[PDB]
Design a protein around this ligand. Structure first.
Ligand SMILES: O=C(O)CNC(=O)C(=O)O
Ligand SMILES: [Zn+2]
Ligand SMILES: [Zn+2]
Length: 235
């Protein structure tokens, strides 16, 4: 009823991606694109520690719903892995440009062909690593650019709402990057009534798959396993 699955397409043409997805601002999962990038066979937990273990990175801890509700700390990848993954409490190496810090890792990925349909130059695209244990929640929010979210390790549950459905999501609208006040998986419907009947797409995103999140399409993301994603912001 309220819930449909995000469509999946194998290697759709540039033209079809443009006409049926990019312009109308509709999400889709692309298959058979990021699928043989070397990172898919290579990036084990072990490999990441060997290559990146000693590098310092920002690690996020807390409810990213309000602003005071969270915090970042700078630590080595090795400290992150032992304190937040191997064995207790919740932390997330989120939204970090790891590939500018460690240029060798750039060899293991590619810029999706589909980005050339934008206006922007290729140098202008922002590439982020999202890396953390099962349970990482990134609350419902919009990004000001288009996104290809590429899953490498593990799976993620993602929920998506149209921008035309903003009213029913009760935005803070205290930031542009607007964020929602509703907990998609434990919402007080007394406090947020209109949300109940709001239509959405969802999916479970698996290794090799790419999620296209249109500019300003609302998204919520939860990691079902030990996870590593790579996002591409572009326009
Ligand atoms: O992957 C996550 O935890 C959240 N990611 C995003 O909101 C994104 O890539 O735009
Ligand atoms: Zn703020
Ligand atoms: Zn986002």
């Amino acid at each position: 009823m309220l819930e449909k699955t995000v469509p999946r397409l194998h290697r759709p043409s540039l033209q079809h991606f443009r006409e049926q997805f990019l312009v109308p601002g509709r999400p889709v999962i692309l298959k058979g694109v990021a699928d043989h990038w070397p990172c898919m066979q290579k990036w084990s937990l072990e490999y990441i520690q060997e290559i990146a273990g000693c590098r310092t990175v920002p690690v996020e801890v807390g409810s990213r719903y309000t602003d005071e509700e969270w915090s970042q700390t700078l630590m080595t990848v090795n400290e992150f892995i032992s304190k937040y993954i191997v064995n207790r409490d919740v932390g997330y190496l989120a939204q970090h440009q790891l590939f500018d810090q460690i240029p060798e890792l750039k060899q293991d990925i590619s810029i999706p062909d589909y980005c050339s349909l934008g206006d922007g130059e290729e140098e202008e695209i922002t590439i982020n690593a999202w890396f953390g244990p099962q349970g990482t929640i990134s609350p419902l929010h919009q990004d000001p650019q288009q996104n290809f979210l590429v899953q490498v390790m593990g799976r993620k549950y993602i929920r998506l709402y149209s921008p035309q459905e903003s009213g029913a999501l009760y935005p803070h609208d205290t930031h542009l990057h607007n964020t929602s006040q509703v907990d998609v998986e434990n919402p007080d419907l007394e406090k947020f009534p209109k949300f109940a009947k709001a239509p959405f797409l969802s999916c479970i995103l698996s290794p090799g798959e790419i999620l296209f999140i249109p500019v300003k399409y609302w998204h919520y993301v939860r990691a079902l396993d030990l996870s590593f994603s790579v996002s591409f912001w572009w326009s």
